[PDB]
Design a protein around this nucleic acid. Structure first.
Ligand code: FES
Ligand SMILES: [K+]
Ligand SMILES: [Mg+2]
Ligand SMILES: [Mg+2]
Ligand SMILES: [Mg+2]
Ligand SMILES: [Mg+2]
Ligand SMILES: [Mg+2]
Ligand SMILES: [Mg+2]
Ligand SMILES: [Mg+2]
Ligand SMILES: [Mg+2]
Ligand SMILES: [Mg+2]
Ligand SMILES: [Mg+2]
Ligand SMILES: [Mg+2]
Lengths: 108, 232, 133, 164
RNA sequence: GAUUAACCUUUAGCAAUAAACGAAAGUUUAACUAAGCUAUACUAACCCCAGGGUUGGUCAAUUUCGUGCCAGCCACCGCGGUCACACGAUUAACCCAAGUCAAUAGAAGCCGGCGUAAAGAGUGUUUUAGAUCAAAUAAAGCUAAAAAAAUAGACUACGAAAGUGGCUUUAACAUAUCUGAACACACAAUAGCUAAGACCCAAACUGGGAUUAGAUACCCCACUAUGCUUAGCAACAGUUAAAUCAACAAAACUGCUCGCCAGAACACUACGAGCCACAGCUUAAAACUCAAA
């Protein structure tokens, strides 16, 4: 572009950043509505442990439960952080282990 | 010792070139690997050689075995040597802006002690040549072969102070801020000296880079510029 | 051995640089001779370009004044029936005799091209040179 | 690279090279110049190279340009008193025009040096305050004085926790 | 208290400074001063006292077992199917260290481009400003071979483009700088409708005839809409000097101006607006998704 065009258009206007599933917050508290398993997209095969949770914002979202073995039940309180599960499409929230009802993974 | 990374061939030394069929020895030359690539199997290797005193070269070698490719590249490199002029045997004579294919290289002459703040491959090649103080910025496509070719081309096409003095028939006088207003004559014409002064261009019509002007005015804000780094 | 980059510098500059750099132990046998008696131009590779736009080659066309006279002669009396002998360094064609006689008239009289032509023809016929129109 | 011919004109260092600082009387400068003619060449250069510098050094002076309205280039300066100053600029280079206007309507170096000395008094070196305004934040930065407790703990006798 | 991922003591004194008041000694102050709590941070330690993460590549650093596309793991690329340096345990090593580093949010963004990747193919005129580059067409007639015009034309002319090639005549082919309209005015080509009219021939559709074994979709006959005639709805100016130059296209570049473009798809889309109006055209998003395209 010419100098006149750059002057008229002015400085570049970077679009506002997109808010993620946590809405720009480190973590979010949530209530477990139901627990289930989902299958990965297929270069990989597994039964990933997931749970549907109603967040403190009121939105219902699917979260992944990391680690080997969980004891989450309905009506239990969990803390969910960001971070996509690369295998599961549409799952962008992860339950924090060792906070509220979700306990740390049992040794071995 | 490792190269640019733990698992990377680049930057690794291959030792001196083998004594040539012409009968010359090259014990004062060091070889460095710049790139290794699988050709679909064979291996293509780009290596550079240099004695640290201005004589340096590079070559490609293709072979089924890696060591054969290394040997071929090294031996062919020693027979295609550039001589690179160095100002005071530590830096380049002037700033060099070049574009080889889609790779752009800006090189800046620097004072003593500045070090090599350059692309890692450029650091390797400069160490082979004997340049110790220089700044370099690589833009466009970062293609290793094009980078090497452009670097050698620009460094081989630099005009020395004596060349400029002979061309313009005038004294090349150096001004150093650390030396005050003292005029240092670095080169004088070998032939006769022109008695008419150079035109005092009130405003030269030079092509400026927005990068340099932006840095000079303080409008550069990059969090990655001027970071502390190991000695190079 | 020297550098095989024939497109970078010249054989002289490459040899000199590699000698000073210590790569070459001894100068080649021709180096001193080249240094003492260099060529007029340093033999550096250059790629020949094509001329576009209003760029014309600087070669001129070789014309002389007498060419005009020659043209008229070759248009009026035609090519002489006697043949040209280009091996003889001092060959004198009929047209050349006409040219010299015309020049003598011009330097010994006025400047009227048609009058000079006809008077030259008359004098050549007087000397005994056949000239058919 | 930087766009346009002579991109050095669009650098702050060049813009600060200007040596004409108008006296406070000058309010408006009009520059009438011609686009063609050798005798106006310098005036054209004056518009190309020096008007940016003059405007940079004199931000509150109104500079306006006019093209091909008269046979001859000229400058006119309007003063606060109501006076007008006419400067003919045929046959004059841009440097000559700059020197002429500097001489007739420019502040001299003595007045500028006086202004800088006045500016110096505003920043008294003895004051203590933020780095934006003062050399030192606190007296504890002065050697021989008691330093910060943040960097050197005070003895117990000088702390209230051990006095109460 | 409630709520949020977010969580300091229901301390002391007016001794200093500040404020209020007083003529003043002085009096008052949850301002403030001095303390309490908290790895949030900085500084300095430490007599014993170290943890957290990481170890396939990017990127410093794995031994032995267990499991077998399961359990699980990853920031990106990816690992896991009986020899897994990538999962779990264990050993060792690596980085930082009273911290470590999982999540979140900032810090750092266009002087680059527009034939083939996103981005410059209807034409002309005006336009506030910026720059320095100051054989056309229309209308009348007429016509030879057989309504549209052999030769000329192996010509390359006229016009802004679309286009213009029989002959005669009458009008007649803007502009002394350049750039600069979706929105103004003219043209242009594109097929289809509205009133009428003509109808030799042809012919979408609609009927009828003949045909294999889902006949011929295809052949034959007839006749509609229609074919016809009116009346209407990148530009400009320079250079060949340089190293020519990703590739292929069409040899490269400069100056100046306008328009347009910033990963894919959503999307020649939705909504809004304008224009029309059976079909619509112009401008033109967002959410979700992906590591590519
Ligand atoms: S800043 Fe003065 S005592 Fe700390
Ligand atoms: K007090
Ligand atoms: Mg490693
Ligand atoms: Mg807090
Ligand atoms: Mg507190
Ligand atoms: Mg109290
Ligand atoms: Mg406190
Ligand atoms: Mg493991
Ligand atoms: Mg495209
Ligand atoms: Mg225009
Ligand atoms: Mg345009
Ligand atoms: Mg639409
Ligand atoms: Mg809308």
């Amino acid at each position: 572009a010419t100098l006149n065009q750059m002057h008229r258009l002015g400085p570049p206007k970077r679009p506002p950043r997109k808010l993620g599933p946590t809405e720009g917050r480190p973590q979010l508290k949530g209530v477990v509505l139901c627990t289930f398993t989902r299958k990965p997209k297929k270069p990989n095969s597994a039964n990933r442990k997931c749970c549907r949770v109603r967040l403190s914002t009121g939105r219902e979202a699917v979260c992944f439960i990391p680690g080997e073995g969980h004891t989450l039940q309905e009506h239990q309180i969990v803390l969910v952080e960001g971070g996509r599960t690369q295998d599961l499409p549409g799952v962008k929230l992860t339950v924090v282990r060792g906070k509220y009802d979700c306990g740390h993974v049992q040794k071995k | 010792e490792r190269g640019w990374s733990g698992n990377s061939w680049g930057g690794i030394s291959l030792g001196p070139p083998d004594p040539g069929p012409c009968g010359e020895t090259y014990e004062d030359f060091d070889t460095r690997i710049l790139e290794v690539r699988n050709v679909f199997k064979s291996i293509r290797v780009l290596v550079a050689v240099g004695n640290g005193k201005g004589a340096a070269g590079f070559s490609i070698g293709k072979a089924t075995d890696r060591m054969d490719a290394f040997r071929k590249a090294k031996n062919r490199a020693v027979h295609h040597l550039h001589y690179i002029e160095r100002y005071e045997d530590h830096t380049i004579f002037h700033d060099i802006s070049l574009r080889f294919k889609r790779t752009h290289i800006k090189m800046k002459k620097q004072p003593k002690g500045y070090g090599l703040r350059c692309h890692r491959a450029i650091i390797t090649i400069c160490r082979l040549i004997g340049i110790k103080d220089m700044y370099a910025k690589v833009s466009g496509s970062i293609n290793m072969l094009s980078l090497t070719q452009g670097l050698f081309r620009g460094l081989s096409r630099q005009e020395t102070h004596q060349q400029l003095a002979d061309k313009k028939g005038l004294h090349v006088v150096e001004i150093r801020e650390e030396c005050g207003p003292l005029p240092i004559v670095v080169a004088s014409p070998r032939g006769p000296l022109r008695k008419d002064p150079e035109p005092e261009d009130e405003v030269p019509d030079v092509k400026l880079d927005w990068e340099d002007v932006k840095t000079a005015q303080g409008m550069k804000r990059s969090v990655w510029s001027n970071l502390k780094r190991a000695a190079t | 051995a020297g550098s095989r980059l024939e497109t970078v510098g010249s054989i002289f500059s490459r040899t000199r640089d590699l000698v000073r750099a210590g790569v070459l132990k001894e100068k080649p046998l021709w180096f001193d001779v080249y240094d003492a008696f260099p060529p007029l131009r340093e033999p550096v590779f250059q790629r020949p370009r094509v001329r576009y736009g209003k760029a014309k080659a600087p070669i001129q066309d070789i014309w002389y004044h007498e060419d005009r006279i020659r043209a008229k002669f070759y248009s009026v009396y035609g090519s002489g029936q006697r043949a040209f002998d280009l091996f003889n360094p001092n060959f004198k064609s009929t047209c050349q005799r006409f040219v010299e006689k015309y020049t003598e008239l011009q330097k010994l009289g006025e400047t009227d091209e048609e009058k000079l032509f006809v008077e030259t023809g008359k004098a050549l016929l007087a000397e005994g040179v056949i000239l058919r129109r | 690279p930087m766009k346009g011919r002579f991109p050095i004109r669009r650098t702050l260092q060049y813009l600060s090279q200007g040596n004409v600082v108008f006296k406070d009387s000058v309010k408006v400068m009009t520059v009438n110049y011609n686009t063609h003619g050798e005798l106006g060449e310098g005036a054209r250069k004056f518009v190309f190279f020096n008007i940016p510098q003059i405007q940079y050094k004199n931000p509150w002076v109104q500079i306006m340009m006019f093209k091909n309205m008269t046979p001859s280039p000229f400058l006119r300066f309007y003063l606060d008193s109501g006076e007008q100053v006419l400067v003919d600029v045929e046959t004059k280079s841009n440097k000559e025009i700059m020197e002429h206007i500097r001489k007739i309507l420019g502040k001299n170096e003595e007045t500028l040096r006086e202004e800088e000395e006045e500016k110096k008094q505003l920043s008294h070196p003895a004051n203590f305050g933020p780095r934006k305004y003062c050399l030192r934040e606190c007296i504890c930065e002065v050697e021989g004085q008691v330093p910060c407790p943040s960097l050197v703990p005070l003895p117990k006798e000088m702390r209230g926790k051990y006095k109460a």
